[PDB]
Amino acid sequence: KVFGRCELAAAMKRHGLDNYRGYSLGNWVCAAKFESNFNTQATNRNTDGSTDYGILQINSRWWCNDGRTPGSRNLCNIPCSALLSSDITASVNCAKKIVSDGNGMNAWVAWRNRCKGTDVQAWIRGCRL
Amino acid sequence: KVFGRCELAAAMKRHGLDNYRGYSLGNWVCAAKFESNFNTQATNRNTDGSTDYGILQINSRWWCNDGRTPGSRNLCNIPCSALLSSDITASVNCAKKIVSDGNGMNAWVAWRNRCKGTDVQAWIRGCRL
Numbered sequence: 001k002v003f004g005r006c007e008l009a010a011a012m013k014r015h016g017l018d019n020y021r022g023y024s025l026g027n028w029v030c031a032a033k034f035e036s037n038f039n040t041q042a043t044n045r046n047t048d049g050s051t052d053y054g055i056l057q058i059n060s061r062w063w064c065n066d067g068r069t070p071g072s073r074n075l076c077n078i079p080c081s082a083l084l085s086s087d088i089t090a091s092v093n094c095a096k097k098i099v100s101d102g103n104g105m106n107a108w109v110a111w112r113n114r115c116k117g118t119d120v121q122a123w124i125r126g127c128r129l
Numbered sequence: 130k131v132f133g134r135c136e137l138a139a140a141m142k143r144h145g146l147d148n149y150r151g152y153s154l155g156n157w158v159c160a161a162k163f164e165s166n167f168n169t170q171a172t173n174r175n176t177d178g179s180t181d182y183g184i185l186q187i188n189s190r191w192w193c194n195d196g197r198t199p200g201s202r203n204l205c206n207i208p209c210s211a212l213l214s215s216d217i218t219a220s221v222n223c224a225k226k227i228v229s230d231g232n233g234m235n236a237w238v239a240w241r242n243r244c245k246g247t248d249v250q251a252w253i254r255g256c257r258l
């Protein structure tokens with residue numbers, strides 16, 4: 001599923017991401033824009049052979065099982081395929097573990113480089129929340 | 130689809146029913162409980178031959194077309210089948226027309242008899258909104 005901006009903002013808010021670990025909703029929308037262009041089915045293979053999955057490009061090196069990342073962990077205890085669903089629940093639940101794990105949203109390279117420090121409220125403007 | 134109480138409250142809030150025409154969200158949850166027991170597929174045939182459809186039991190006499198209510202109107206400009214979808218949008222959009230049409234939520238007999246005047250906030254307690 002490819003979300004519209006405000007559509008995804010509402011869904012993310014429904015799923016409790018607004019102010020989660022202190023990150024306002026626009027941080028999460030911005031991260032999703034630049035990680036996946038709002039596409040739940042986004043996948044990208046990393047140099048190390050791991051793959052990133054879903055609207056927040058969660059990495060099979062650590063967070064999900066895809067059966068083809070030798071030596072990896074599955075810290076969210078989910079198949080990576082679950083992160084490609086139209087239903088963003090598995091992605092959100094795994095993102096909550098990631099953001100709680102010490103480095104906050106810096107785990108998302110695109111957030112650090114493109115969203116951090118910026119006017120992230122812009123990402124939720126015009127949206128009914 | 131049979132909604133859970135808090136699930137339906139969130140959906141109704143997403144769809145702008147909270148405070149719509151001055152009716153707080155718990156009015157709408159209460160009405161849905163007693164009209165349909167939260168079941169989008171609820172149907173009931175009236176004495177006059179019209180049928181009521183969906184989570185808010187909208188009547189084919191006035192509001193939707195079902196092809197079998199002679200002499201009726203279709204004021205929401207929708208097939209009655211649309212009011213049975215798991216996606217409550219058509220029901221909500223048609224309910225907004227009904228509640229705006231002069232008698233407010235009194236159009237729903239179950240609301241008038243069972244919800245009106247009561248502690249409707251109870252219907253949204255324990256819910257993340």
Ligand code: VO4
Nearest residue numbers: 044045046052059
């Ligand atoms: O394509 V990935 O480099 O974001 O882990």
Ligand code: VO4
Nearest residue numbers: 173174175181188
């Ligand atoms: O079953 V109906 O009497 O609510 O219009």
Ligand SMILES: [Cl-]
Nearest residue numbers: 054055056057
């Ligand atoms: Cl994801």
Ligand SMILES: [Cl-]
Nearest residue numbers: 067068069070
């Ligand atoms: Cl693996």
Ligand SMILES: [Cl-]
Nearest residue numbers: 021103104105
């Ligand atoms: Cl942090």
Ligand SMILES: [Cl-]
Nearest residue numbers: 183184185186
């Ligand atoms: Cl309905």
Ligand SMILES: [Cl-]
Nearest residue numbers: 196197198199
């Ligand atoms: Cl008809």
Ligand SMILES: [Cl-]
Nearest residue numbers: 150232233234
């Ligand atoms: Cl009124």
Ligand code: NA
Nearest residue numbers: 060064072073
């Ligand atoms: Na893995």
Ligand code: NA
Nearest residue numbers: 189193201202
């Ligand atoms: Na009709």
